[PDB]
Amino acid sequence: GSTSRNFSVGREGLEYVWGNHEPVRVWAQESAPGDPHGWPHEIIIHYYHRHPVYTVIVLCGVALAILVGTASSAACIAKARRDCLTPYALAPNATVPTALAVLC
Amino acid sequence: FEHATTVPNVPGIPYKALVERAGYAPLNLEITVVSSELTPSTNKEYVTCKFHTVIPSPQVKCCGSLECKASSKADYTCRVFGGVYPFMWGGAQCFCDSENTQLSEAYVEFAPDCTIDHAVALKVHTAALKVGLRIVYGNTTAHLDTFVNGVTPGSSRDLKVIAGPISAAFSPFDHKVVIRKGLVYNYDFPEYGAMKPGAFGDIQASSLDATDIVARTDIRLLKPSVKNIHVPYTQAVSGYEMWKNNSGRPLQETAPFGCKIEVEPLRASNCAYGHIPISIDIPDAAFVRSSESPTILEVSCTVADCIYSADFGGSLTLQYKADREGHCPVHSHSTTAVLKEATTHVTAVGSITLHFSTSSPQANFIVSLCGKKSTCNAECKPPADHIIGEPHKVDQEFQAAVSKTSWNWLLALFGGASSLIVVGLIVLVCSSMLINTR
Amino acid sequence: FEHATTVPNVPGIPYKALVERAGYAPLNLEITVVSSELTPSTNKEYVTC
Ligand SMILES: *[C@@H]1O[C@H](CO)[C@@H](O)[C@H](O)[C@H]1NC(C)=O
């Protein structure tokens, strides 16, 4: 009849031979929306249309890294804080009040 | 002097490289592959086509018996019958009231148009590649052609060249391949000796004019019912034609890597895969030395615009203050920027506009005029025409595919996390070793 | 290629712009409306005098 036929072409290329014509080769380059130099969110609506299974794992990697860094540093320095409460019961005063203002 | 490099294997696009020695001037070296055929070593087994059942005029023996022999022609089938009484036009062709016998034999052989319409069944293995490439050294050119195993040089006028072995050695063919009328297929035909009735490989011959052919297509005879004389027979459908109906698309348009497959030497021209290593020697007649070469001073490149595409998108201007005038090589020492202008003509206070093409989202590479380097940053934009009829001259390298800012965000975002872990560890150690001594 | 631009609707006064391709020199582009007609869809009912 008369029909539209969607195809898909990556970086490596594609040819099509319609009837008794000669083959017509076509290579496809990137025009993903956004901008790799604009600082906001549009820097990763670009790298999602190009290689989508890599951007999600690298974003989850850095989000897991920042949460584990914040949690591990907070827990370890809180343990190191509680390992320095040798003056208790307040019957003498605190040793360095500037250090207690830093800590408490 | 000897210089070795590893070009990509895509027919058509060059690979820019330099050579340099102690006390000598640099020299440009672009080489490209213009034809690359992949021919395998074939071995023919048999030649087959559509058959033609030949039935001779049936014997009849009157008031007697008749038993039949064994013959060597293809699919010979005999059968005798007791008590027939045949009529030709003048009736009663036998003087024997229902005690006579007849013979009925049939066999099979080639049709008279199989000298054009025959399929050939081959068996291919160990495809070895050959390259026609174009060496350009020191404003001189040379055309040559070499085998690509790493031991066989093919020279051209004092220019030796060792093509090392290709990384991914393969062929587009299987172990078994069949050809009719210039169309290669990719089929699994039966061995010469195992005939299946009503499938491909039905007639067999080592050559199409041979005498001792082999067939098995179940000629079975039937008892003559009617009084007129003829020989009833049935036969399976021709396996060559009911293959030819279901042949599928040929391997001229289903083979990978852009291979164009011809038939008459059974080659596979212009396949695009892998990398090849090349080791050439350059004669000393082209290596000009630095005592007479035009040396260079005060170079500072800068960019004006950059797209990253397959066409030459970027364009950079350049300043240079040479003391003398001549021809100095221009090159970029990256692997993501290929530079179009191979050579230039320098003057005292002039300026050169160049062209390049990239795939990295930004350009941080160094260009080189006549011996010494120069650096210049850029900022490249995505293009709009996202289908073009020209292949990419570069690769991506998968680390420079991120810009400065997209690299910079995530690297700062977990550098801060690692640094706060380090400072928590050191304040932990400091407080612990302060208190445990008490 | 095609270059999008919103010219204002004031008859006579041009709106200059230049276009830019990579590797090619920039090219100017002047756009001006010179006369604009506004025609509706007309349905006649009657005639009186
Ligand atoms: C070609 O190379 C030779 C090598 O000495 C050089 O003298 C000559 O000027 C070059 N020719 C051109 C046109 O650049």
Q: What type of residue is B216?
A: R
Say whether B192 sits in a helix, a strand or coil.
Answer: coil
Contact B387 A62 (CB under 8 A): no
State whether residue C2 sits within 8 Å of chain B by CB.
Answer: no
State whether residue A36 sits within 8 Å of chain B by CB.
Answer: yes
B424: which chain A residues are within 8 Å (Cβ-Cβ)? 72-73, 76-77
State whether residue A22 sits within 8 Å of chain B by CB.
Answer: no
Report yes or no: B95 and B63 within 8 Å, Cβ to Cβ.
yes
Chain C contact partners (≥3 CB pairs within 8 A): B
Contact B305 C1 (CB under 8 A): no
C23: which chain B residues are within 8 Å (Cβ-Cβ)? 305, 307, 311-315, 355
Q: What angle do CA B244, B247, B251 make, to 5 degrees?
A: 135
Q: Which helix (H) or strand (E) holds B32?
A: strand B27-41
Q: Which residues pair with B214 in a beta bridge?
A: B204
- Which residue of chain A is at minimal alpha-carbon distance from B403? A36
State whether residue C47 sits within 8 Å of chain B by CB.
Answer: no
Contact C22 B309 (CB under 8 A): yes
Residue nearest ligand 1's atom 1 by CA: B139
> B362-401: b or e for each residue (b if 16 or more CB lie within 10 Å)?
bbebebbbbbeebebebbbbbbeeeeeeebbbbeeeeebb
Between the alpha carbon of residue B72 and those of residues B57, B69, B401, C43, the distances in Å are 19, 10, 72, 97
CA of B139 to the centre of ligand 1 (A): 7
Report yes or no: B282 and B27 within 8 Å, Cβ to Cβ.
yes
CA of B329 to the centre of ligand 1 (A): 11
Instruction: State how far the Cα of B313 lies from the Cα of B306, in Å rounded to an integer.
Output: 6
Residue nearest ligand 1's atom 11 by CA: B139
Q: Which residues pair with B81 in a beta bridge?
A: B102
DSSP A56: H
Chain A contact partners (≥3 CB pairs within 8 A): B
Q: Which helix (H) or strand (E) holds B354?
A: strand B354-358
B421: which chain A residues are within 8 Å (Cβ-Cβ)? 69, 72-73
Measured in degrees and rounded to the nearest 5, phi and psi for residue B357 equal -140, 135
Q: Which helix (H) or strand (E) holds B366?
A: strand B364-369
Distance from CA of B306 to the nearest CA of C (A): 6
State whether residue A87 sits within 8 Å of chain B by CB.
Answer: no
| Token code pair at residue A10 | 């990556």
Q: DSSP strand E in B340-390: where?
A: 343-345, 354-358, 364-369, 372-377
Instruction: State how far the Cα of A62 lies from the Cα of A44, in Å rounded to an integer.
Output: 14
Technique used: cryo-EM
Contact C22 B384 (CB under 8 A): no
State the closest ligand 1 atom to the C-alpha of B326, by its place in the atom list counted from 1: 9
Residue B165's nearest CA partner among B129, B132, B134, B133 is: B129
C25: which chain B residues are within 8 Å (Cβ-Cβ)? none
Instruction: State how far the Cα of B31 lies from the Cα of B287, in Å rounded to an integer.
Output: 18
State whether residue A26 sits within 8 Å of chain B by CB.
Answer: yes
Q: What type of residue is A41?
A: H
Contact B314 C1 (CB under 8 A): no
Distance from CA of B338 to the nearest CA of C (A): 15
DSSP B105-123: EEEEEE-TTTTTS-EEEEE
Resolution (A): 3.3
Measured in degrees and rounded to the nearest 5, phi and psi for residue B363 equal -115, 115
What are the helix and strand counts (H, E) for chain A? 2, 2
Crossing angle between the packed helical segments B404-436 and A52-82, to the nearest 10 degrees: 20
* Biggest CA pair distance of chain A: 102
Residues in contact with ligand 1 (CB, 6 Å cut-off): B 139, 288, 327
CA of B289 to the centre of ligand 1 (A): 13
